[PDB]
Amino acid sequence: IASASCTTCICTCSCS
């Protein structure tokens, strides 16, 4: 629900 780089489709994922 809240993180960076790491899910399939909600909204974050990774990025630096």
Cα gap 16→11, rounded to integer Å: 15
- Solved by what technique? NMR
For the four alpha carbons of 11, 1, 3 and 6, in that order, the dihedral sign comes to: negative
Give the DSSP per-residue string, 1-16.
Answer: ---SS--SSSS-----
Please provide the size of the chain in residues: 16
